[PDB]
Amino acid sequence: AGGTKIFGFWIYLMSDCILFSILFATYAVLVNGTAGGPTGKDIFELPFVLVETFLLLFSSITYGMAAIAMYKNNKSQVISWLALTWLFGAGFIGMEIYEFHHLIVNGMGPDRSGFLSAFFALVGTHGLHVTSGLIWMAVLMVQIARRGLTSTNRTRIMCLSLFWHFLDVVWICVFTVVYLMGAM
Amino acid sequence: LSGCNSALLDPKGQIGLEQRSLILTAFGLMLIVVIPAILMAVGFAWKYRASNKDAKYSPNWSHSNKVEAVVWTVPILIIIFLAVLTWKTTHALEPSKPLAHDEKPITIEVVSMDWKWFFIYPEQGIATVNEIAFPANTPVYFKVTSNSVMNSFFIPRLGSQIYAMAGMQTRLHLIANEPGTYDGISASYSGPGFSGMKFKAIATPDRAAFDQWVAKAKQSPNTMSDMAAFEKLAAPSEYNQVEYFSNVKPDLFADVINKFMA
Amino acid sequence: MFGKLSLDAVPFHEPIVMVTIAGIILGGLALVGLITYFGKWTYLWKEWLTSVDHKRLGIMYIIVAIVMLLRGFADAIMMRSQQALASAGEAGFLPPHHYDQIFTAHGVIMIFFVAMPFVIGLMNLVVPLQIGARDVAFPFLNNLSFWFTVVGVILVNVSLGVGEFAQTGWLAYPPLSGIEYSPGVGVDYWIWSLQLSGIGTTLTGINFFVTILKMRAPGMTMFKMPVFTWASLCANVLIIASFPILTVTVALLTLDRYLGTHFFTNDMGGNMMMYINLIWAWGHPEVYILILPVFGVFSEIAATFSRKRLFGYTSLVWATVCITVLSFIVWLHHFFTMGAGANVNAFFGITTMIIAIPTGVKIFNWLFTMYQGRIVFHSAMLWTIGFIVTFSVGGMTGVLLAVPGADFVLHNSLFLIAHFHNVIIGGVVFGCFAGMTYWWPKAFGFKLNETWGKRAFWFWIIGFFVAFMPLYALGFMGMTRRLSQQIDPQFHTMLMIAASGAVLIALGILCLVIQMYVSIRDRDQNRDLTGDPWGGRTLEWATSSPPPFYNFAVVPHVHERDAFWEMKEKGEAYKKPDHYEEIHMPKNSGAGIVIAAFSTIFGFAMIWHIWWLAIVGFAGMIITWIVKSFDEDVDYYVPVAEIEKLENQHFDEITKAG
Amino acid sequence: HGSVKTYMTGFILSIILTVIPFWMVMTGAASPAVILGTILAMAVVQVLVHLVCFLHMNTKSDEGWNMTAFVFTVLIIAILVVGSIWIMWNLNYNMMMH
Ligand SMILES: CCCCCCCCCCCCCCCCCC(=O)OC[C@H](COP(=O)([O-])OCC(O)COP(=O)([O-])OC[C@@H](COC(=O)CCCCCCCCCCCCCCCCC)OC(=O)CCCCCCCCCCCCCCCCC)OC(=O)CCCCCCCCCCCCCCCCC
Ligand code: HEO
Ligand SMILES: COC1=C(OC)C(=O)C(C/C=C(\C)CC/C=C(\C)CC/C=C(\C)CC/C=C(\C)CC/C=C(\C)CC/C=C(\C)CC/C=C(\C)CCC=C(C)C)=C(C)C1=O
Ligand SMILES: CCCCCCCCCCCCCCCCCC(=O)OC[C@H](COP(=O)(O)OCCN)OC(=O)CCCCCCCCCCCCCCCCC
Ligand SMILES: CCCCCCCCCCCCCCCC(=O)OC[C@H](COP(=O)(O)OC[C@@H](O)CO)OC(=O)CCCCCCCCCCCCCCC
Ligand SMILES: CCCCCCCCCCCCCCCC(=O)OC[C@H](COP(=O)(O)OC[C@@H](O)CO)OC(=O)CCCCCCCCCCCCCCC
Ligand SMILES: CCCCCCCCCCCCCCCC(=O)OC[C@H](COP(=O)(O)OC[C@@H](O)CO)OC(=O)CCCCCCCCCCCCCCC
Ligand SMILES: CCCCCCCCCCCCCCCC(=O)OC[C@H](COP(=O)(O)OC[C@@H](O)CO)OC(=O)CCCCCCCCCCCCCCC
Ligand SMILES: CCCCCCCCCCCCCCCC(=O)OC[C@H](COP(=O)(O)OC[C@@H](O)CO)OC(=O)CCCCCCCCCCCCCCC
Ligand code: HEM
Ligand SMILES: [Cu+2]
Ligand SMILES: [Zn+2]
């Protein structure tokens, strides 16, 4: 039944991909609706985005390490790699929250313009997905610690693997379409 | 069902006449295949009822290349013809397309309000609520916008409707083939006053009658010479009676649109 | 501490709404008291509410759909009466503030909580049986999906007595639905009902898709599945691909209303045309989601009651696949008149009329299934024939609307109302009634009364035509949708004829209610002993009626299309297996109902801006999810003795019959 | 199921395909068209690298239905995004004061 669950989660991720696509289309439509406020070029700090991108990529690689450890039946290495992945994802989330807070306190929040609304929607939806992945990862780490690498937990590790790698893929799309294209 | 003297089946404008022809053509083309479907449903139901012991019974007959080929191809031919006609007519009946006509068009600016229609005659320097006049057999160029919410400017007996969006300009070209008074509506629900968003489009016999109507509007004691007067008029109201304004502010349509494009 | 919620939210001043609230409360109290008196609370909780059995969940879906059909039709009757009165030159009894609520709620209810739950429940009941599976892939997910649908139903019904529902039309176009022009709670009721129900709908799509792909019995290749299974698969593909669109679009509207964002506002860079684009990009796939399963139902019924193989199986399947793919490239025909220009309009009109070809292929394949058959005029077959006629007419008018030149003068007219009611009632409603009649013996073990079923069919079809042909005429006379006050008198005759048609439909619904009552009363004389009352052709008829809670003691092995028919033709039906084995089954769970209750609290709190309560509800949803994730005992084995007993009773029935 | 080697290969390839676009945009390496084409192409290639190395996408998993679902989803996304952009571009052009 594990294979069925992993396939079903893949299908759910396809639906999530279409969700993100709708957000991307909205951003493309509203990118120039800046309403006399900031444009992407006036707020996108590329080194910050690069650090965030590297954090998310490192988290993806560390989750790959955790999955490898799982297939070697090494509980301790699985937990350690999951903890490192959690820390990298938490860093990504912290940087994103800091960026959003900076925009908000300077009257640059989603209510300022259509462009800012779309930017907040897309980037914050990705961040909400990352936060859900982090809560899921914490629950899964506790469960693995309590009961080890059972078949249930192995299926859950695979499902979360799909989710986390998909989040980094969405982030590749996000940084390319939003940050690099706005900064250029 | 339909109605012979209906607004769409008995149109008084060129656009409406072409649209009637298009509707009838599509109806006939589709009937070609729809009528056989219904007749076959009923006739097969009757003829091959379980009671009838004379009718041929073929329990295991499930595929026929000839039958499948026909049922696939006939709709394909019908739809190819329909699609060619669709491309041609959609490009010919494009609402923003100016009409080919000897007479110069009259520009009427249209602003939907809550809940009544405001009209500006920029060339004649007058404005009206819920009533427009123009010479018959004279193309009319409609510039359409909204002050609050989505509406649809529609004169059914003359032809195409067009959406009215705030901060946006849509363009519609109509022409009346005969003089008369034609009912106008909003075709996009816009709130509690929607039912009363009716206006009259008066197609005059000649330019003299339209000029008399313009002059009658010009003797209005009221004016629309400032955005404050427009805002006063735009306060929510329903079932607005016909009103006339003289000395309308120039570029008033542009100002209404610019209110939403800061 | 109560947000915006206050006693003023209750519409005391409104007599009609207050009478309705009192009536619903009294009915709920009566139901609670009857359940208490018969002491069935434990039975209900243990066998239906927490059920993870797809058959129970399908029945519950259909129960919800029928109950909400009652309210939707009451709304329709009120609208017809108001329009008849207003076209005579009278105020009527529904002012715009109530009438606009009524038509918005009617649309939302009939689409999301009548049509959707009906087809979903039919698929839930039938699909696992047809493919030879014992359950859906994710049974607990199935239960949770049903309860999210119930959450939506509860929210939309609560909007009756607390606050009001949206007055924007059933898709809530901004900026009319935005905070500026819709400051009340109605749009928020709309938002949260739709969002919470859409979560469950998306999960159902995933569940059914995986179920059909992965849980089929050995030997049943894709092109040996019953056509209804193909239709369900395509519908679930559309659900998975399209309902995320609705999720996002409603979420963006929510951000606009709550956080003052500028996605769809008139100013500050917003663009409401984007909302219209997105909502209809979801919306057309929705109508195809509704219609495909009933196409499958009609395929099954026509083959069964023609006593003949379905004609052109491969052609039918590929037409279904074609419709599925093409349903995503046509959505702009819903706003042809917004002014996209000739190129875009022409392209989308052409795609719209292209996707009509496979539907005609399906219609003619059914006709040739009836050709040279032996047609038994069971009420289900009457529904099928009536569907062919009515849906042909409706689809014809739809294709007419696909031509942008004609749509320019028919858009939002009562011609459009007539078209989509023609297709909806002729296809979806007719097919739902047909499938309900067809599979009632499978679900419950006895047949419906045929006399009242046929009366219901005749009332429904004749009343539909009387109710909606005048609307085609009215569309040609220039009458637009959503008119309620001072309707122009020349529409009055058509509006009266439409009202009389609506009364005929009301009689049809009464006939259905009487049919259910009489069938239940006389169930002992109309038992389905063999599990094959109609001489069916697919595996669902290979089981007992009702099927054992595990469906099949032994997973069947299929060799051809119409596996059960081939088993009957080869004498292999009703063969006692040499031995039985224990069956793995999922346990019932109350977690789904708890998550749904927390979701209901969360939605209600968000509607009334009770922030602390919304936090409590959301935290409850997530925490219940996690706690369930910690559960280990979620399955059990059916002892071989139980299976032996059930199979022996079924085989005693089979031997007694013949 | 992958291996350490393929994960590190994907890691290095992702690092390169991420660094180059950022450097190109930050430093104005080439003309705007060249920069845009490069970053879009490298983003697509990096997505493929992640799908292969990290998600182990292949034509055999789940009887091929894994790949089938992904390809269908990509097609649906292309339809939705491109159609929305085209429709909105045309609508906005027709909404102007011309
Ligand atoms: C293999 C696994 C690996 C596959 C994956 C790897 C490949 C990746 C590619 C993607 C996969 C492609 C699909 C392959 C399916 C694989 C499974 C399989 O084949 O075995 C199952 C199955 C075997 O089941 P079975 O148990 O053995 O029983 C079968 C019986 O033997 C059958 O007995 P029968 O008597 O019932 O025969 C029925 C016969 C119908 O009966 C007839 O023989 C009469 C023929 C009617 C002619 C009228 C054609 C109608 C279409 C009009 C098109 C107009 C031109 C289009 C121009 C473009 C538009 C501008 O067939 C039809 O139903 C025709 C329906 C065609 C409608 C498709 C929509 C039209 C657009 C596509 C144009 C190309 C159509 C080719 C027509 C082929 C004709 C055979 O195979 C079949 O279905 C039989 C062959 C029919 C296949 C139909 C092909 C669909 C075409 C879609 C192509 C779309 C273009 C690409 C766009 C994609 C992105 C948008
Ligand atoms: C499940 C319901 C359902 C179904 C199945 C359909 C099917 C179709 N619809 Fe309909 N629709 C539905 C429900 C709705 N439609 C709408 C709106 C809508 C609009 C927008 C018009 C406007 O807003 O002004 C158009 C153009 C169409 C066209 C079509 C077409 C071409 C089909 C085709 O799929 C039909 C194909 C079938 C045919 C033709 C009949 C059988 C064929 C025969 C007999 C043989 C072959 C014939 C030919 C080749 C011609 N629809 C709306 C919006 C209402 C709102 O705004 O609130 C709703 C709810
Ligand atoms: C605007 O409202 C309108 C409609 O909607 C648009 C209508 O439906 C209708 C037509 C209504 C019809 C008669 C349809 C009847 C069909 C029925 C029986 C099926 C309805 C389905 C139900 C059983 C609801 C199922 C969901 C529920 C269990 C959720 C519970 C929701 C409830 C009952 C509403 C909440 C009401 C509150 C508790 C009121 C608050 C109470 C107060 C504090 C005091 C109350 C005082 C009074 C006098 C008792 C009208 C009258 C209308 O104008
Ligand atoms: C425009 C866009 C608008 C829409 C915005 C959308 C925002 C939400 C987007 C994020 C959606 C999150 C998706 C969560 C996926 C988790 C699905 C899941 O449960 O995995 C299935 C896996 C299968 O294993 P199984 O044994 O069957 O257990 C099933 C559960 N009992 O089961 C497991 O592995 C166990 C999982 C345990 C449960 C973990 C739940 C954590 C996620 C909670 C989500 C809410 C987070 C709140 C975020 C902060 C809000 C401020
Ligand atoms: C589903 C759609 C997703 C879209 C998300 C974006 C919309 C949210 C935008 C913020 C609301 C508007 C500002 C109101 C608030 C406002 O205007 O008040 C201004 C306020 C600053 O004042 P303070 O509250 O600090 O001052 C209080 C003191 O004076 C006394 O204690 O800003 C904030 O603190 C908000 C910053 C939150 C930033 C983090 C949230 C970002 C979104 C979530 C991203 C995902 C990751 C989260 C994981 C935990
Ligand atoms: C919309 C709000 C819904 C209410 C939510 C809160 C639920 C409250 C009940 C939970 C505690 C129960 C503890 C069990 C305690 C226990 O073991 O005894 C529960 C007991 C079960 O006994 P039985 O009725 O089967 O009779 C026992 C005999 O058969 C001898 O064995 O039932 C009751 O007495 C009433 C309980 C349910 C009352 C119903 C609640 C109201 C629901 C209203 C919904 C509308 C109607 C639609 C229904 C389809
Ligand atoms: C959106 C959903 C809204 C609710 C829909 C209406 C249904 C209401 C429930 C029907 C009455 C159930 C009668 C139990 C009948 C009964 O006797 O219980 C049966 C059951 C078992 O009791 P027994 O004494 O039979 O023990 C048998 C043992 O062998 C254990 O299996 O008790 C429970 O486990 C608790 C179930 C009641 C509690 C469930 C409801 C609570 C959740 C819903 C409320 C939300 C809470 C959160 C809000 C903050
Ligand atoms: C005019 C419009 C043109 C329409 C053309 C559309 C073409 C459709 C071709 C689909 C690709 C099929 C390749 C499967 C290749 C594969 O791995 O499957 C292999 C599968 C074979 O299954 P079996 O081994 O059980 O054997 C079945 C028979 O082929 C044996 O004779 O092929 C099929 O028969 C599938 C038939 C198409 C059914 C399509 C289902 C719906 C597709 C969408 C699924 C994704 C949803 C994701 C949710 C977001
Ligand atoms: C501040 C006010 C707090 C009031 C919260 C009300 C809690 C009432 C719980 C009723 C549960 C009914 C049990 C039915 C019994 C039943 O059948 O359901 C059982 C079901 C799952 O339990 P198991 O996993 O043991 O499975 C049992 C069976 O289902 C076997 O399959 O639900 C739970 O136990 C989840 C508990 C959720 C607990 C929610 C915690 C409260 C959340 C709010 C906290 C807010 C904090 C804010 C922080 C920012
Ligand atoms: C049972 C018979 C039905 C009747 C008599 C009926 C009647 C009507 C009426 C009178 C309207 C308003 C028309 C207008 O604007 O003037 C309408 C709207 C509508 N109906 Fe029905 N209807 C019925 C069944 C259904 C069903 C089964 C569905 C869908 C599943 C449905 C969906 C709708 C929708 C979506 C609208 C548009 C609501 C909108 O204004 O926002 N109807 N109905
Ligand atoms: Cu459509
Ligand atoms: Zn516009």
Cβ-proximal residues to C116 (8 Å cutoff; 6+ apart), any chain: C65, C149, C201, C289, C290
3-state secondary structure of C582: coil
Among candidates D10, D54, D73 on the partner chain, residue whose Cβ is nearest the Cβ of A18 = D73
Q: What is the pairing mode between strands B131-135 and B243-246?
A: unpaired
Element holding B128 (H helix, E strand): strand B126-129
Q: Please provide the size of chain D in residues.
A: 98
Long-range contacts of C325-328 (CB under 8 A, 24+ apart): C326/C351, C326/C354, C326/C355, C326/C358, C327/C238, C327/C284, C327/C285, C327/C288, C327/C355, C328/C241, C328/C242, C328/C281, C328/C284, C328/C285, C328/D76, C328/D79, C328/D80
Token reading at A33: 């609706």
> Quick one: resolution in A?
2.2
Cβ–Cβ gap A18/D80 under 8 Å: yes
At residue B193, what are phi and psi to the nearest 5 degrees? -85, 10
A35 and A114 in contact (C-beta within 8 Å)?
yes
B33 and B74 in contact (C-beta within 8 Å)?
yes
Residues C135, C140: Cα–Cα separation, whole Å: 11
Token reading at C468: 């909606």
Q: Mark out the alpha helices in B146-205 (DSSP H runs).
A: none
Which residue, among B212, B122, B182, has the nearest Cα to C478 in the 3D structure?
Answer: B182
Map tokens 């669109």 to a residue: C245
**C281 C-alpha to ligand 2 centroid (Å):** 15
C11 and C18 in contact (C-beta within 8 Å)?
yes
Biggest alpha carbon–alpha carbon distance for chain A: 58
In the β-sheet with B180-186, what is the strand arrangement from edge to edge?
A: B131-135, B199-204, B180-186, B151-154, B162-164
3-state secondary structure of B177: coil
**Burial readout C154-185 (b: 16 or more C-beta within 10 A, e: otherwise):** bbbbbbbbbbbbbbbbbbbbbbbbbbbbbebb
Q: What is the CATH number of the domain that holds C497?
A: 1.20.210.10
**A132 C-alpha to ligand 4 centroid (Å):** 6
- Mutate which: B162, B169, B261, vs D, most D CBs within 10 A: B169
Among candidates D2, D32, D55 on the partner chain, residue whose Cβ is nearest the Cβ of A162 = D55
Q: Please provide the size of chain C in residues.
A: 658
Residues A136, A86: Cα–Cα separation, whole Å: 10
Q: Mark out the alpha helices in C96-169 (DSSP H runs).
A: 96-108, 116-130, 139-161
Local structure of residue B250 (DSSP, 8 states): T
Nearest CA-CA distance, residue C325 and chain D, Å: 9
Residues C203, C436: Cα–Cα separation, whole Å: 24
Residues B240, B234: Cα–Cα separation, whole Å: 11
- Is residue A107 packed enough to be buried (19+ CB in 10 Å), middle (13-18) or exposed (0-12)? exposed
Q: Which of C29, C31, C42, C634 to mutate to test the pocket of ligand 7 (most atoms within 8 A of CB)?
A: C42
**D65 C-alpha to ligand 1 centroid (Å):** 19
Nearest CA-CA distance, residue B166 and chain D, Å: 10
Residues C90, C84: Cα–Cα separation, whole Å: 9
> How many Cβ pairs closer than 8 A exist between chain B and C?
283
Considering every ligand atom shown, identify the ligand nearest to the alpha carbon of residue C420 and give its number: 2
Catalytic residue among C229, C299, C384, C413: C299
- Mutate which: C237, C262, C584, vs A, most A CBs within 10 A: C262
Range of the structural domain that residue C200 is part of: 52-552
**B49 C-alpha to ligand 8 centroid (Å):** 37
Ion ligand 11 — residues with CB under 5 Å? C 284
Please, what is the Cα angle at A79 between A77 and A81, to 5 degrees?
65
- Is residue C231 packed enough to be buried (19+ CB in 10 Å), middle (13-18) or exposed (0-12)? buried
Token reading at D23: 């450097």
Long-range contacts of C571-580 (CB under 8 A, 24+ apart): C573/C542, C574/C651, C574/C654, C576/C647, C576/C651, C577/C553, C577/C647, C580/C553, C580/C554, C580/C640, C580/C643, C580/C644, C580/C647
Residues C646, C654: Cα–Cα separation, whole Å: 12
C416 and C410 in contact (C-beta within 8 Å)?
yes
B161 and B134 in contact (C-beta within 8 Å)?
no
3-state secondary structure of B22: helix
E strand segments, D1-98: none
| Beta bridge mates, B184 | B199
B183 and B131 in contact (C-beta within 8 Å)?
no
At residue C137, what are phi and psi to the nearest 5 degrees? -60, -40
C413 within a domain of the structure (yes/no): yes
Show me where the domains of chain A are located: 1-184
Please, what is the Cα angle at C83 between C78 and C87, to 5 degrees?
155
Residues A137, A148: Cα–Cα separation, whole Å: 15
**C55 C-alpha to ligand 6 centroid (Å):** 23
Cβ–Cβ gap A18/D11 under 8 Å: no
Token reading at B68: 């499948």
Which residue, among B95, B191, B97, has the nearest Cα to B151 in the 3D structure?
Answer: B191
Cβ-proximal residues to B51 (8 Å cutoff; 6+ apart), any chain: none
**Subunits close to D (at least 3 CB pairs below 8 A):** A, B, C
C488 is catalytic: no
C467 and C501 in contact (C-beta within 8 Å)?
yes
Token reading at A21: 């696509």
- CA A99 and chain centroid, separation: 15
C475 within a domain of the structure (yes/no): yes
Residues C562, C570: Cα–Cα separation, whole Å: 12
Task: Report the sign of the C-alpha dihedral through residues C407, C408, C412, C415, in that order.
Answer: negative
Contact residues, chain B, for C309 at CB < 8 Å: 59-62
- Which B positions 146-205 lie with beta carbon below 8 A of chain D? 165, 168-171
Residues D42, D39: Cα–Cα separation, whole Å: 5
Token reading at C159: 């909007």
Long-range contacts of C519-525 (CB under 8 A, 24+ apart): C519/C440, C519/C446, C519/C447, C519/C448, C519/C449, C522/C449, C523/C444, C523/C445, C523/C446, C524/C446
- Is residue B4 packed enough to be buried (19+ CB in 10 Å), middle (13-18) or exposed (0-12)? exposed
Cβ–Cβ gap C339/D95 under 8 Å: yes
Residues C348, D84: Cα–Cα separation, whole Å: 12
Amino acid symbol at C92:
G
The secondary structure of B227-243, three-state, reads HHHHHHHHCCCCCCCCE
At residue B128, what are phi and psi to the nearest 5 degrees? -145, 160
**Inter-axis angle of helices C313-326 and C272-306, nearest 10:** 170
Long-range contacts of A75-80 (CB under 8 A, 24+ apart): A75/A144, A75/A148, A75/A149, A78/A144, A78/A149, A78/A157, A79/A141, A79/A144, A79/A145
Total number of domains constituting chain C: 1
C492 is catalytic: no
Token reading at C84: 């008849």
Q: Is the CB of A19 under 6 A from ligand 5?
A: no
C317 and C223 in contact (C-beta within 8 Å)?
yes
| Beta bridge mates, B129 | B118, B243
Torsional class of A146: left (φ above 0), alpha (ψ -120 to 50), beta (otherwise): alpha
* Number of other residues whose CB lies within 10 A of the CB of residue C38: 9
Catalytic residue among C55, C216, C411, C421: C421
Contact residues, chain D, for C343 at CB < 8 Å: 90
Ion ligand 12 — residues with CB under 5 Å? B 165, 168; C 273; D 95
- Ligand 10 atom closest to the CA of C171, numbered from 1: 41
Token reading at D81: 């995004």
**Inter-axis angle of helices C591-607 and C186-214, nearest 10:** 150
Cis peptide before C546 (omega within 30 of 0): yes
Rg (CA), chain B: 25
Residues C484, A8: Cα–Cα separation, whole Å: 47
Q: Is the CB of A143 under 6 A from ligand 5?
A: no
Which residue, among B113, B8, D88, B6, has the nearest Cα to C408 in the 3D structure?
Answer: B8
A57 and A168 in contact (C-beta within 8 Å)?
yes
Rounded (to 5) percent helix, strand, coil in chain B: 35, 25, 40
In the β-sheet with B126-129, what is the strand arrangement from edge to edge?
A: B170-174, B140-146, B106-113, B116-121, B126-129, B243-246
Which residue, among A164, A147, A134, has the nearest Cα to A65 in the 3D structure?
Answer: A164
- Is residue B184 packed enough to be buried (19+ CB in 10 Å), middle (13-18) or exposed (0-12)? buried
* Number of other residues whose CB lies within 10 A of the CB of residue B73: 11
| Beta bridge mates, B25 | none
Residues C434, C300: Cα–Cα separation, whole Å: 10
DSSP string, A32-96: T--TTS--HHHH--HHHHHHHHHHHHHHHHHHHHHHHHHHTT-HHHHHHHHHHHHHHHHHHHHHH
Element holding B116 (H helix, E strand): strand B116-121
Catalytic residue among C419, C455, C568, C650: C419
CA distances from C1 to C88, C252, C258, C435, D47 (A): 48, 27, 18, 48, 48
Contact residues, chain D, for C245 at CB < 8 Å: 80
Rg (CA), chain C: 25
- CA C30 and chain centroid, separation: 27
List gaps in chain A by the residue before each (C–N > 2.5 Å). Answer: none
Task: Report the sign of the C-alpha dihedral through residues A154, A155, A160, A162, in that order.
Answer: positive
Q: Is the CB of C481 under 6 A from ligand 10?
A: yes
| Beta bridge mates, C635 | C586
Which residue, among B173, B191, B137, has the nearest Cα to B12 in the 3D structure?
Answer: B137
DSSP string, C412-468: TBHHHHHHHHHHIIIIIIHHHHHHHHHHHHHHHSBPPPHHHHHHHHHHHHHHHHHHH
Q: Is the CB of B80 under 6 A from ligand 1?
A: no
E strand segments, C488-604: 583-586
Show me where the domains of chain B are located: 14-92, 106-259
